[PDB]
Each structure stands twice: as structure tokens, then as C-alpha cells.
């Protein structure tokens, strides 16, 4: 089984406080709208 | 596995050389009205400055 | 034709006021200058790191 | 996109689509009308002779 990840899987990169700013960071993330495996096993 | 870490009394409203865990710098420490997340330790400005 | 000219001038200044209030791209030059200065300063700060 | 309370309200994947690449390269959450240089297409070699 397969399904759509949509926009889930985002976690805070680090324990840094930021207010009302846009931050571009590169790290391990779940791709948006990716195909994720569904198990029922 | 590491030994004990020394601690010193806190000083406000005075230019001091501060060392909080791994963050080192020099400046004046004042009371803050901001709110941090429970897991967050320090805040950074828009110019990558603590 | 004094009255017509006066009325036309008043309507024109009103239209200028409305255009300034509505159009945000009218002041593009000053905003561009300020943005360029901010970008230069931020680039310098980033290069410091 | 961090809020004022330190939480994130939205995220953009740079490699999702050309629009997302534009969003990343402008470093802004809203893209204004126009044209923006985003990437650089380069044909890669396939064989070694």
C-alpha cells in the first residue's frame, strides 16, 4: 500500500528561538507530497 | 562521561564575558520580555547573531 | 476660464493623492535603494561568519 | 516560516516545483509578478570515450 505524505514530517532543526523570520536550512527532511508506505503486519 | 562544570554568580547590567554552556561572548545581560519554547536554549536575530 | 482651471487642478491633486494611497509601486526607487543597502549590510554580516 | 511565538507555521520544499524554487531563491513566502533567475540547466555527460 502507498499514500501521499502531503506536508507532514517537519521537525525543528535545532533548539534555536526565532521570531517572525523565514529561515532556509538544509538537512534530512521528508519530501513534500512524497509517496510513503502504508502498513495495516 | 565528563567531570563537573564550574558555575559562577550571575551579573546583570554590566559588560561581562559570558559563557553559557557552549555559547561564549561579551556583552550586557538584561531582563528579557520574550518567551522561549521549552526545548529552545538561545535565540538568534535575523543576522545570525545571538 | 479661471474656475475651470481651479477645479481641474483640485481634481488632479485629489487623483494624485488617491494614486499615492493606492499604488504601492509608485515609490519603487527609494524602496529599492533601501533594500540594496540592507542587502549589502546583511551580505557583509553573513560573510563575517 | 517562524511565527512571533517561536513556532513554525509553514514550510516550503525548494525542490518541489519551479514555483517553490522561486520561493526559496527570493527567500520570501510570497512571489511578486515578474521573472526571476532560479537555476542553471547543465547537460551532463553520458559516456567516457
Amino acid at each position: 500500500a502507498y499514500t501521499n505524505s502531503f506536508t507532514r514530517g517537519v521537525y525543528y532543526p535545532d533548539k534555536v528561538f526565532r521570531s517572525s523570520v523565514l529561515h532556509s536550512t538544509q538537512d534530512l527532511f521528508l519530501p513534500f507530497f512524497s509517496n510513503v508506505t502504508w502498513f495495516h503486519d | 562521561v565528563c567531570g563537573p562544570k564550574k558555575s559562577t554568580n550571575l551579573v546583570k547590567n554590566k559588560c561581562v564575558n559570558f559563557n553559557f554552556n557552549g555559547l561564549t561572548g561579551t556583552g550586557v545581560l538584561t531582563e528579557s520580555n520574550k518567551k522561549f519554547l521549552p526545548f529552545q536554549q538561545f535565540g538568534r536575530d535575523i543576522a545570525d547573531t545571538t | 476660464n479661471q474656475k475651470l482651471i481651479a477645479n481641474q487642478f483640485n481634481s488632479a491633486i485629489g487623483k494624485i493623492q488617491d494614486s499615492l494611497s493606492s499604488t504601492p509601486s509608485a515609490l519603487g526607487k527609494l524602496q529599492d535603494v533601501v533594500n540594496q543597502n540592507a542587502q549589502a549590510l546583511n551580505t557583509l554580516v553573513k560573510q563575517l561568519s | 516560516k517562524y511565527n512571533e511565538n517561536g513556532t513554525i507555521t509553514d514550510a516550503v520544499d525548494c525542490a518541489l516545483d519551479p514555483l517553490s524554487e522561486t520561493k526559496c531563491t527570493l527567500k520570501s513566502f510570497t512571489v511578486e509578478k515578474g521573472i526571476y533567475q532560479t537555476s542553471n540547466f547543465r547537460v551532463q555527460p553520458t559516456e567516457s570515450i
Side-chain angles (χ1 to χ4, degrees), chain A residues 1-18 21-26 28-41, chain B residues 2-4 10-22 24-30 34-44 47-50, chain C residues 1-20 24 26-31 33-49, chain D residues 1-20 22-27 29-31 33-47 49:
Chain A
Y2 292 87
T3 188
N4 196 330
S5 64
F6 295 114
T7 53
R8 302 296 189 180
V10 180
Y11 61 95
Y12 288 98
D14 205 337
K15 306 172 178 176
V16 183
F17 172 82
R18 300 179 183 87
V21 292
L22 316 181
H23 198 147
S24 172
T25 187
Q26 186 272 330
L28 294 175
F29 292 92
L30 181 70
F32 281 166
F33 298 101
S34 177
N35 210 343
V36 296
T37 315
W38 185 11
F39 296 92
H40 293 258
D41 47 10
Chain B
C2 299
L10 191 149
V11 174
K12 291 176 168 174
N13 306 317
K14 180 133 65 72
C15 275
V16 301
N17 194 334
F18 53 87
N19 186 359
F20 290 79
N21 300 335
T24 66
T26 302
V28 174
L29 279 77
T30 68
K34 299 174 182 175
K35 302 297 182 183
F36 274 15
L37 293 179
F39 61 92
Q40 289 174 334
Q41 293 305 110
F42 61 95
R44 192 161 290 174
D48 291 331
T49 61
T50 301
Chain C
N1 298 283
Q2 189 173 336
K3 272 73 59 163
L4 319 180
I5 294 168
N7 290 335
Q8 287 174 339
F9 176 77
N10 299 343
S11 294
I13 69 169
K15 285 179 185 179
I16 301 299
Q17 184 180 31
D18 282 344
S19 177
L20 290 174
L27 287 89
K29 298 175 181 182
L30 310 170
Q31 195 62 50
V33 168
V34 172
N35 292 341
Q36 285 183 35
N37 287 276
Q39 284 168 353
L41 261 70
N42 285 339
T43 290
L44 183 142
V45 172
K46 295 294 292 296
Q47 289 302 143
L48 178 56
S49 295
Chain D
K1 172 177 177 181
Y2 283 78
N3 64 1
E4 69 273 24
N5 288 335
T7 72
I8 63 177
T9 60
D10 212 330
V12 179
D13 191 342
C14 297
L16 174 61
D17 52 57
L19 184 55
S20 294
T22 302
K23 284 179 181 177
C24 285
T25 188
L26 292 177
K27 208 175 177 181
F29 204 74
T30 294
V31 174
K33 185 172 195 181
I35 182 171
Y36 314 92
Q37 290 81 15
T38 65
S39 189
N40 47 0
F41 187 29
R42 299 185 188 279
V43 179
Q44 304 304 302
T46 68
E47 299 188 57
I49 308 303

